[PDB]
Design a protein around this ligand. Structure first.
Ligand code: ATP
Ligand code: ATP
Ligand code: 9U6
Ligand code: 9U6
Ligand code: MG
Ligand code: MG
Ligand code: MG
Ligand code: MG
Ligand code: MG
Ligand code: MG
Lengths: 267, 267
């Protein structure tokens, strides 16, 4: 019993991390497929009977509660943003991130990050709210990618940020630590750099980048009317789910018609 | 004291429905503006101190709990969808809704409704789950609009639907009724029609359309592999918020950097 590539692909779609089933165990495709179909139907029936919550939606709600309870204001800002935000973010037209932008109409695009909208909120809210200003947003972001096991074209970003007092490296690391401890995810912090922000603190789980974080001020602040110390971090929710559920491919965690909570919908 | 159009616009931005303040009361602009700025800063400070939840996010969470508790599976599907879905939905290239579509790249668009993704889920889930199949989704949808007091280009749709047993007009009306009673919103049902679905039951609050709902089957089902009775309804969350909070302009409820929970962010 040698399986074709098409057969192995079909079994891999139906296989879940908790299965102790090897596709090369010598059993024929028909028996492996029947067993996995039965397991996945049972898994989906259990979700439908007892849970009914989508992993991405449930994780957004859990993260929302965590940040609201710690004094951060919940933001919901536009997903369709001016293309001018990309240039004012310092993303020059010939840079790598600029090629990843999904253009809409003529002057708009799908946001590839939450940062510009949140910078506008920090500036505006600092005229009305007491120091420090603490805000966060969770929602869809978009980048054209080569599509590996760790990138999606449509993903979900969390960005939390603070402006004013308490905007230090140690406070930023403390929030990241409390957040990932709340989710039960081990991590380390490594130095890296990017073009928008300069140096970042990257939050790594093994070789998987969970977040890039920044301690301001940076020279870019002036173009956004930011004139105080700030800290912020952006996390991909699908990457968090990939770690939590041991998914081999991030597509299992994505907005999709092909998987529900990591279970194939082709049953 | 006659106010210019620019001055009146500024005061209208700062005015909230609960204020018993008339912009034509004869008081000068400087006093009306100072009073309203003070009220709105206080309102925002109270939210920041005591609540911190965004109206759109909080309403999504409340609706999610309502449908999950009543046996509907929570869906999060792609916002960027194939342009082919628009033609297979019967939206011919020269129709009115087709002109409202935001195109992305060459073969994709921003979804103007949730229905096609949910039809795919109904079909797929019917192979695995017991009758009846009950699902819902909340999330961003996009339409180019003339932009009045009731339309946004970027809005948030709820669509709940069911396939199999219990897919009758009376059950559909009963779910709509239980849902709007839960939110405390009065309504009536009127007959209307649209091009995708044919006859609809429109859910009206006064002259404001809160939802269009459909009792299947319809001939379009075959193009989506739907072969059982079904019911479904789509609601705009920003319209629900407009009713709940007596907003004069739906922009107060939208994803925005210009308003937070209906309060101007230009303070
Ligand atoms: N295409 C993508 N798919 C899924 N998640 C992503 C994607 N791009 C970024 N993220 C998540 O958003 C976070 C903040 O975005 P950032 O700009 O730092 O990404 P990045 O450094 O380009 O990530 P990578 O180096 O893996 O491409 C990332 O740490 C990651 O968790
Ligand atoms: N541009 C929009 N902005 C905000 N909400 C909308 C918009 N278009 C539709 N909705 C909401 O989505 C629901 C379902 O969409 P549907 O296709 O029935 O809208 P519609 O009949 O085009 O609405 P209208 O007649 O007001 O344009 C509507 O009843 C409404 O609550
Ligand atoms: N690291 C993540 C995003 Se982190 C930015 C936190 N958001 C924020 O409010 O910054 C204020 C700010 C932003 C730009 C210019 C001046 C001031 C990423 O690369 O996608
Ligand atoms: N009235 C709202 C959307 Se209502 C559709 C409910 N969703 C669903 O699952 O329908 C099954 C289905 C859909 C199309 C073709 C065949 C079968 C609007 O106009 O935006
Ligand atoms: Mg990248
Ligand atoms: Mg990186
Ligand atoms: Mg990074
Ligand atoms: Mg319309
Ligand atoms: Mg209508
Ligand atoms: Mg309608």
């Amino acid at each position: 019993p040698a399986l074709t590539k098409s057969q192995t692909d079909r079994l891999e779609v139906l296989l879940n991390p908790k299965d102790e089933i090897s596709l090369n165990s010598g059993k024929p495709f028909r028996e492996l497929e029947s067993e996995l179909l039965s397991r996945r139907k049972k898994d989906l029936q259990q979700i439908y009977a007892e849970e009914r919550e989508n992993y991405l939606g449930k994780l957004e709600r859990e993260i929302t509660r965590f940040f609201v309870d710690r004094g951060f204001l919940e933001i919901k800002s536009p997903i369709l943003i001016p293309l001018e935000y990309i240039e004012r973010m310092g993303i020059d037209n010939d840079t790598e991130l600029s090629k990843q932008i999904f253009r809409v109409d003529k002057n708009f695009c799908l946001r590839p990050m939450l940062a510009p909208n949140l910078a506008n909120y920090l500036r505006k809210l600092d005229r009305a709210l007491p120091d420090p200003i603490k805000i966060f947003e969770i929602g869809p972001c978009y980048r054209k990618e080569s599509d590996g096991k760790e990138h999606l074209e449509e993903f979900t970003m969390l960005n939390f940020c603070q402006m004013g007092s308490g905007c230090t490296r140690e406070n930023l690391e403390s929030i990241i630590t409390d957040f990932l401890n709340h989710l039960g995810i081990d991590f380390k912090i490594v130095g890296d750099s990017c073009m928008v922000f300069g140096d970042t603190l990257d939050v790594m789980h093994g070789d998987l980048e969970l977040s890039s974080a920044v301690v301001g001020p940076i020279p870019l602040d002036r173009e956004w009317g930011i004139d105080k110390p700030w800290i912020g971090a952006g996390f991909g929710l699908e990457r968090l789910l990939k770690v939590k559920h041991d998914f081999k491919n991030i597509k299992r965690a994505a907005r999709s018609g092909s998987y529900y909570n990591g279970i194939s919908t082709n049953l």
